[PDB]
Every structure is written in structure tokens, then in C-alpha cells.
Symmetry: D2
Subunit: 334 residues, 4 copies
Amino acid sequence: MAVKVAINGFGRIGRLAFRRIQEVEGLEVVAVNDLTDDDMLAHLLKYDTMQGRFTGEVEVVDGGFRVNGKEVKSFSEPDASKLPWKDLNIDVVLECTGFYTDKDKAQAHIEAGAKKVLISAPATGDLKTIVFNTNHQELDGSETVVSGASCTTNSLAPVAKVLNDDFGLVEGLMTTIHAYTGDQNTQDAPHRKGDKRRARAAAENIIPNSTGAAKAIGKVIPEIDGKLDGGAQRVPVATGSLTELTVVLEKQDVTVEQVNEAMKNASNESFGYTEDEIVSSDVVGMTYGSLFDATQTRVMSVGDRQLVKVAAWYDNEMSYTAQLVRTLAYLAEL
Amino acid sequence: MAVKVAINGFGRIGRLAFRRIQEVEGLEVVAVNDLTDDDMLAHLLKYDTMQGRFTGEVEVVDGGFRVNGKEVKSFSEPDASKLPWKDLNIDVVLECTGFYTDKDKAQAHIEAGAKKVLISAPATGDLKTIVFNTNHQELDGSETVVSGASCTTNSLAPVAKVLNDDFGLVEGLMTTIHAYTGDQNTQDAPHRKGDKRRARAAAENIIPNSTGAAKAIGKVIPEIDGKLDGGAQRVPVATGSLTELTVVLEKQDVTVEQVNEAMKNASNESFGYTEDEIVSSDVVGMTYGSLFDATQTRVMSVGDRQLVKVAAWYDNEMSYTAQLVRTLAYLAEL
Amino acid sequence: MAVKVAINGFGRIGRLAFRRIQEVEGLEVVAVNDLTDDDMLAHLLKYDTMQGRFTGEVEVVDGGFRVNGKEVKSFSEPDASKLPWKDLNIDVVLECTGFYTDKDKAQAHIEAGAKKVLISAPATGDLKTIVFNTNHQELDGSETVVSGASCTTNSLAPVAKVLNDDFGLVEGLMTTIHAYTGDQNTQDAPHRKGDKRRARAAAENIIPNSTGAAKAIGKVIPEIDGKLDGGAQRVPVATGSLTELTVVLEKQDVTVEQVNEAMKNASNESFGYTEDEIVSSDVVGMTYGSLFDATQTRVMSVGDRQLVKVAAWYDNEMSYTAQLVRTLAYLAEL
Amino acid sequence: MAVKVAINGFGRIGRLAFRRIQEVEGLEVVAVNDLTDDDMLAHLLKYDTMQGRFTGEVEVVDGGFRVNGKEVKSFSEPDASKLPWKDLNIDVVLECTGFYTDKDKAQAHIEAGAKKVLISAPATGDLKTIVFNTNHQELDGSETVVSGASCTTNSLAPVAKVLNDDFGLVEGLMTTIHAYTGDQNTQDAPHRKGDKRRARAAAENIIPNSTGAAKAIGKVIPEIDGKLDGGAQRVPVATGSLTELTVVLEKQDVTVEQVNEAMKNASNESFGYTEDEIVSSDVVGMTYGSLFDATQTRVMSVGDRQLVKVAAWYDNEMSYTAQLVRTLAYLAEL
Ligand SMILES: *C(=O)[C@H](O)COP(=O)(O)O
Ligand SMILES: *C(=O)[C@H](O)COP(=O)(O)O
Ligand SMILES: *C(=O)[C@H](O)COP(=O)(O)O
Ligand SMILES: *C(=O)[C@H](O)COP(=O)(O)O
Ligand SMILES: [Cl-]
Ligand SMILES: [Cl-]
Ligand SMILES: [Cl-]
């Protein structure tokens, strides 16, 4: 009956995908692969600084752990191709290590015996990049490796698609005021990728930086390829982020009410709408991929010439996870 | 000899203006008025969380306190018009309470006996609004009440003026990623002005909010009145902010290097220039009113149509204070 | 059929008590009094930075608001004696303003027409001070004004009671590493009670300070009156605290296992026990008044002479609140 | 004829030792070894989140960098014994990597050609452990490898020595409320040494943990070996810490005044004394190894039996660094 999921990399996304898959029927996590030990993994599953105590029960058993009476096998294998995916009958691997963000590298899971692989990051090579409820329709079923884009990309796609479809997108720039991630440093130190800004103390600074969304958007919405670009400001909150988008449009007498109303009409399970004066902590744990915030809509008009600004909240952890799981369910049924 | 300054409201700006006036000759702080007691005031002058230990010496004496052997009189008077400004021979009152941000209300200092009043915030009524080195030239000497604009306005004016003068500003939107201020709440609580967002825990949230700069900019640069607008994102750093500006320009083939070079050429004591990949804490205590950050310049080109984004750092405390003291000095010598 | 509660002061404790009263049958909040407006109050009930979104539904109606279809009346009355408690049939007032922490002052609610008043803080005068499951048994029913002690006092009582009962408490000192509260400043500023330390930036400092538990403990456990004292270190977390207690005991060969086992055996609904290496954010929202942490037990032995150190976690918000509502329920049924 | 210093590991301590050595004559940093690249190194020297902009001038030149016109050679060598210490005429290596905290491992610097090695951490094997102005006197000059103890050990030694010498120390327990360090995680993640608590988000939790001071104290003050023990609470401030010590003494009628006066009398360049109601940020960048805080002295008396509590501030970064450089200067001159 149920789809067999294996998670590669029990990091923030992996553990959160695990939690979310608990609320979805027809999906079981049967395997978890990470290089850390099980005591540490069970402990980090049980307790989460921003996302709260894990509601079920977690105990380390022989071949891995038992979560709510169910067995999850665990491995400590740094080379994906070795993994017992064949033996275990994996339907889809949720690839969250960061170390396989390439169609050809991610192929190792298929050799090891898995049917499909969903990469929880933008990925290079000949594959589809999917934001659920924006372009998942482009999955036919034959694909064996799929990127699930990025957290910011998921916050951006539904907003740009409305803007483009209803008003015609000429060009836009974007800033995500974005929570700090574990790839940033606790104290000023050398950084892994030589990034002089990720090098700095994460929780004490506004840190300018790049975004996946910037380049990976034209992959989700081909008709606006090359028309958006932008970056991030990493700031001292541990999760919860906000995308601001400033654009020029074809349509001529755009009003604040027009924009909001267009977004309200496009809302669904993936794309929320709010008129409440909320703040970042109010979206910690939410399962919308993107929450349009109508209170932040601005329109600058100077003669016939307009600049339109909008903003959308997202839990860069849970919102992205929720979107990823949705893509996973859909992918598993083709 | 030296210009006699009285500070009204020994808050963040007041105390920091006091510190700064120590480094400037021809200006003495002779009076300080605030409704708290002297022990508390001397303590808060001596010790500063973000700005460091006060370098001199501070002790509570009879009529107030002694700072580096100099006597500062202190008062506890909630009605400004009562104050002994006449008796003390105040040349200028630095007005920092928040409660006199109006030409007519601030007139109370002139009645009480002071020559001029500089308001450390945007103010209402018939008065000039001054950003030093952008439009201080518009002071002729007869003015008796002057607004010193806002911190964000000071971060913005030199940037917009270069943009307008060299490229022609059609329109622009702005976001300041801005440190939290004492008008925000420690924990989620009722707020004094009914602001549902400033109501929230300051150091635990990205908090969308409004900016003084938005409206008060056309007062500093009349030729761009009504052409900019924007807001803030209050974030968990205690001081240090960054203004991002996204604009449309008249000039047609604008490059990143064009913009940066324009800004570098306009740099002075008020307006800095940097190419160093810095972060917010890197500007804590800086005395530029605005620091242009050439690493953040971005230009989006789609056919003949460009969007230009620039960003300038500022210490919303010290940067603004340094600008304010400059305006003070200049005003005193007319 | 249900007990009628009116909450005075819709601060952190008031709103959280309101939330908690939702899960408890036989208690209805029918009135809420606070000096702010209803839009603000409904908003702050709906959204909580640390404690999450309010699960039900909240909307502003005519005489106050509707929570999950139930009507709550709201008032804006600064003199408690005026309040329509008589007219409303209030059984108990949960007094959470801070401004009535005295038997004689709190009497104003009884005049206004309420049966009993439970003060959510230590209070002065001739009244009982109660920590549920430590000494609630001392309520006979005739009392009309009761103190619910403090958050820290609630974290400490069950621990000290076990220590005293099983080993004999000679003397002890205590430190609570304690989350910052809304009585502390956002930025270095004058403070309302002249506290030079509460004056300081709350989220940027380890701030030494006093505790309610210090003096209010002998009121809960008379037999150890004058035997404990201690303070607080306010630190940059928004909720979640930890009490460390260092003691000298009568019993002679105390082991770590002895202490832990004694605590484990005394555990109940109010007083939890754990051996998991948790951290503060792990107790956000917990309903134990005190959670003993057996991983932190330490025994120092030099010859026949021992120093025993123990530690107990508490959500100084929700832990205290759950305790307070328990006392409330019990008081209402006498 | 100035002393030639080489720094191994340009981390927080290394960079701060470099800064400090600028203010000390007779000491030159001529070499710096770290595995990161020079651009990163120059950048992190120039800019410091907590300790401010580097006051001189730093530019990347050929064999390393130029600081205030002076040449500093830089290497990228993971095996210390290879390093050109002989060729460069190093007098002392300041060893700050963390990876050579053992007399036998640190011997590699002597092989590579340095005269002496001072390890900026507690170290194992046959060597002296020094806290300047507490026991530096025990250096005779023949030693070639020395440990400089730990930051907390330095905050503790002068206080314990006074307590022991004046009142006679029976036993004590200790907690340092301690700034988070770079060895803690930004977000909940696996930890390098399997530490379930260092694993957690550093800036969002009170995190119980261990301390170097606990065991390394009897090495500095042999007469109190085995008489103290204690731990840490890592809390969300980036630097600035506080040691609380709870002790039992021989002397019988100890008063608060007695203790404070004893500490006041023992104060020097390494050991400060204050009666100001300060907080953590007030000690960032201070050069005392330890600052006794007479406002936190408590004495619990029940009959003839007392518990005495004291507390001392220290910038676990700069205070420790200042102590380390003093030990360095002294070691160099034997
Ligand atoms: C979200 O997937 C990640 O934390 C941040 O990168 P973006 O490029 O901001 O998505
Ligand atoms: C500085 O003026 C103060 O923070 C207010 O901020 P604005 O962004 O200038 O309104
Ligand atoms: C909890 O009631 C409140 O924060 C007071 O803390 P204490 O340290 O218990 O006074
Ligand atoms: C100080 O050297 C470093 O932060 C380690 O702290 P301890 O508590 O002294 O181990
Ligand atoms: Cl403000
Ligand atoms: Cl309080
Ligand atoms: Cl460490």
C-alpha cells in the first residue's frame, strides 16, 4: 500500500521531512542514511529548538530506531551507490546531504537500487526543477531524478506567476530577509566555500548574501527566465524568512487592491494569503510554501510609470519541507 | 568662547550626542533635562551595551554630574517652557524626547530662554529638515527651530542625491533592514501607539514596519518629492542598519561600475564609500551618516529597461548622532 | 455549571492563563480588563512569539471579543474597585497587572463584587502564598485573596521540599539562569524602579538580578524559612529558565543516585523528572511547574563534608501559568 | 631584539592575541599559521563583531600581509613540525589551534625550530599550567612548553586564592554563565565530539555544559586541588562571561564586607575590583583576567554554618588573551 521513502542526510530538512511524512498517509520512512551515530540522530529527532518536541516516541533499537512502534533502518555510508536501496525496495530517496546536488552524482541512488530521487536543493544537469502547485504538472512520471528547488524559490514562484500571468512581468529585483542557516558560522571564522560573509557570527549581524531563488526561478517559470535576480540578508532569527519583490509590469494602472485580490484568488494549500500584521515567528512551523502578505503591498506611481512591491513569508525550514513532501507524494504516484 | 548646548531627553540619542560633543571643540553640554534621576543617568552615560564604556570619568555631584572635571546641570522638568534656559545661556537645545517633534511645541525652549532648537527626529510645521552635507547649505541663520531628519533619512539622502543628479531619478522603492529600537517591546505586549507589529518581541522576530525616511525625503531633496516610498524590517540586532534602494533611472545604459564610481566621487565626512564585504556590527559606532556599499550594487537589464539596486549601511545610533552634532555646530555659527 | 474567571491585566501571564483555561473544563474566562484597546488584545492573543499561534478563533465583536464562539467582555478600567464584577458574577479574579500585589490593594476586586482573587506574583500582607502540589493543601476555602507565588518559586519549591524532607536542609544558595521578561529594557534606557541592571539591553547581556523565589520560599515551606537565598542571571532567551540550587544537608553520605531517585519518586503533574540532555527551548510551553534535571546533579565531597548541587528547568511563562490555573481550579472548589 | 612571536591558528584567540601584541612593546608577531587563505585572514583581523574594527591598517601582500607597515609571514601548514620556525627565529609560538593541546604534540614546534610554546588552552602531559599574577612565579625559565590555562580558569584563580589564603577553603562549587563559543553549533546539528548539548542552536538556548576551570584549577593552586568542581551554562551572548562560586570556609564569622575588602586588597593588572552594577557587555574587550563584582557577594548564615557566594566577570575572549600575552612576555624574558 504505502510508498517507501529513504532519507539521505538527517539534517534540518531530512529530520523535518521525517516529521512531516508522519502526518501523510501512503508514505513511510523506512531508511535513514547519515554519517553521525544513532543516539545523536534520535536525540535530534526528539528535540528541535524552533520546531518543538517530536510528538510521538523515539527510541534507539538494534538496526536503527523505532518511531511510534515503527522500525527505521539507519546507515552510516558516505558513498550513496553502496546503500542497500535495492534490498530495501526504496521508491524514492529524499536527498538532503547537499553533497549530491547534481543529476549525475544523484544517479548513485538509482544504481544502489532506488526508483526515483528528489533533491532537496537546486541541482545541476538535465532534470526538472519543481515547486509544487506552481509547475508540478510538468512531471510526466518517467523522471528518475528531480530537484525540489530551494526554500526561497518556493516562496517566490507562486507570487511571480500571478504577477506575470495577470499583469505581465517586465523585470524585477528581490531581497529575502532570511533566517540564518547552519552553513553560517557561530563565531567569526574561516568559511568552507571562502565566503567572507557567511564567515561571520550568524546571530549577531545582518549579513548580505546570495540566494538559490535568483537563478533557479527561470527553471520553474521559463517565461520569466532572466527577468528576476536578487539576494539575501541573513539576519538573527533561527527560522522564518520573508521575500520582498520589486517589479515593473506591463499592465498600466495597477492598484494595491488589484495586486492583493489577484494573489487572494490564486491561493491554495501551497500558497497562503493573509491580511494580519504578523511577524517571522508567526510562520515557524507553517505548511504553506509561501504566504502572501497583503499588508506589505506597495505601489509607486510617477506619471504613467509604476514600481510594484510585494512580500511573502515562509518558514525556510517547514514551508520548504511541506512543499518537498507534496512533490514526493505526487512523484511516487506516477 | 564655546557654544552652550542643553540636551532635552537623555535617551539613546541624547547620551550619544553627549559623548560625541566631547570630541568636538566649541561645543559644551552644560545642561541635561530628563525625568529620571541622576544616579541612573550617570550610570547609563558611563556604560553602553553597543557603544562601549564612556572613556572619560563620570560622577554624580550636587547640581547634576561632573564629566571629566566639567559640571553638567541636570533637571527633572516635564514642561520644557519652565526650564532655566534663559538663566543658563543656552545657545542650542538638542531636543531628543520624542514629545516635542513639532515646530509649535518645540517653541517652548525658545520661551524658556534658548536661542535655537534642533529636533533629533522628523518634525511637523513650518521648519527646515536638514541632513548635513546634503542640504545644510539651506540654513541661512535666522531659523530658531530645525529638524535633523531621521537616521534612515540621513542614510538615504546622499545616495538619492547622487542617483538623481547623475542619472535622473524616475521613481524608487526602499527597504531598511533596521536594528530594533527602544520603542519596540521586549516581549509581546500592548504597544503605546497601537502598532500590532512594534508590539512584538523585538529580538525574536523580523518585524515589518514604517520609516521616517519615506515621507521626510522630499523635504531634504525637493526635486524628488513623491518619487520614493518604502518601509522597514526591524530585525534582532541592537544597532546597525542597512538601507536598500531599488530605482528606475532616466540614464539609459547604466552599469554597476558607473553607479559605484558616481558614489565614490561624492564621498565625504558624511558619506562614506566601501568595497569591503562588511556586516552590520562593522558599522557600530561609525561617524559617517551613510556608508555606500559598492559590493551590493545590482543592475537588472531587460532590453532597454533597467532596475538599479543600491545599499548603504548606517549606525542608526552613532551615524545619525554624528550628523546631528555636525548640524548643531553649523547652526550655532550663524 | 462552570467557574467564572475574570482576568485583570492581559499581559504575558493573563493571555497565557486565558489559553490554558481553554483546555480546562469548569473554568470560563468571561471578562478581561486591560488599559489597551481590543484590536491589540485580540491580536496578541491570536499570535505569540514563543508560545505559537492560538489554536482556536479570535475576532473582535461589540462588548469585547469572541473566542471559539464564546463571548468575552472587555474593559479599560484603571481602578479595579469600579469593575462590574458583581454584575458579571465573577467567582475568581486572576490578578496579573503587577499593580495590585498586596492583600489590601487586591481587596478592590472583592468590593467590585468578585468572590476571590488570585495574584499571579508574590504579594504582601496577610494572605497565603501557594505553589500547587507543594502546599495547596493549606487552602481551607475561607481565603478571599491568595498569592500564586512566582515562576521561580514554583520551580524551586518541589525540589527544596524533597531535599529537606529526605536529607534535611541545613542551608542553600540558588541561581536562576532566567529568560528576560517584559519588565527589562529593549535598549539601554532609564528603568522604572531605578534598577541599573534591568535598565540594560535585555537580549544582549548577561544581567545579574534579584528573584521573587529568594524571600517568598519560606512562605511556601515554613520549615526552611531563612535557609535559602539567591539571585538571577537574566540572559538572552525570550522564555525558558533554569534554577540551580547549591545546598548543605544533614544526611551524611549523599550520592548523586540518592538525590535523583528521591526526586524521581516525588514526581507528579506539577513536578517532572528527566534524564535527557535537554536545553531551554525544550521546555517552552511545558505544563510542569518544575522539571528536575537529573543530568545536572553534582555532589562535592571533601572528607565528611558535602556540597550538593541540583538543577530544575521551567518555562517561566507556561510552567508558572499551568501552576496558577491549577491553584485557581482548586480555590474555586472550596 | 624584540621578542619574535609566531601564532598557530588564527582563530578568535590568535587574532585577538595579535591585536593585543600591537599594544605591547618588545613583542612582534612575525609569522601566522592557519589553513585558510590570506584574504580571509586579513579580513577577519580587520573586522571583529564583538571587539570592533582593527585600529591600524591591514593589506594582503606577497608572503602574507602588512600590518601598519610591518610584514607578517603566513603559512597554510597542517603539520606543525614542518613549519619554518628555525628559519624565522621564533622565540615563542602562541599555540591556538586546539589540535596540539598536549606537551608531546606541541613539541613539534620545538622541532620545527621555535624556542618555547605557550598553549592557549589547558594541556595534558608534563608541563606547567599558568595564570598570570596567580602562579607565573613558578616559571623558572627552562620550560619549553607551557599551558596558559583556560579563560574561566583565569577568572577563577585570583578569587579562589584570596578565599583560600584569607579564610581557608573547605570546598566549593562553581557555575560560569558563559558566552557561546565557535565550537557550538549555529543550528541544531551533529556535534564533532558527540556533545548532545553543544549540538544545539547556540544563540537560542541556555545550554548546560562543562568547564576547563573545573579540573585545571588544582594545577594552578595545588593547595586546593580536588576542592572545587563545577560547570557552565552557555547562553546567547557572543562574548562576556561570569563565574559564580559557592564555597564553605574555615574562618567563622565571615561577612560580606570582609570578603569584598579581601578581594579589593588583592587587586592588580590581572585582577580587577568593581562596585558598579555592570552587565556582560560592560566587560567586552577588558584586559583584566578577572573582575571581582562586589555587588554580587552573598553570605548565608544558619547558626555557626555559612555558605559564601561570590562572582567575577571576564571577557572570555579579551581577558583571557590579555592574560595569555602577559604570560608570553614573561616567558620570553627568561
Ligand atoms: C532554503 O532552501 C535555504 O536555507 C536558503 O537558500 P535560499 O537560496 O534562500 O533558498
Ligand atoms: C532613526 O531616525 C530611528 O531609528 C527611526 O528610524 P527611521 O527609519 O529613521 O524612521
Ligand atoms: C516569573 O513569575 C517571573 O519571571 C518572575 O521571576 P522570579 O525570578 O520568579 O521572580
Ligand atoms: C576559555 O578559554 C574558553 O572559552 C573555554 O571556556 P572554559 O569554560 O574555560 O573551558
Ligand atoms: Cl524609532
Ligand atoms: Cl518580573
Ligand atoms: Cl571552547
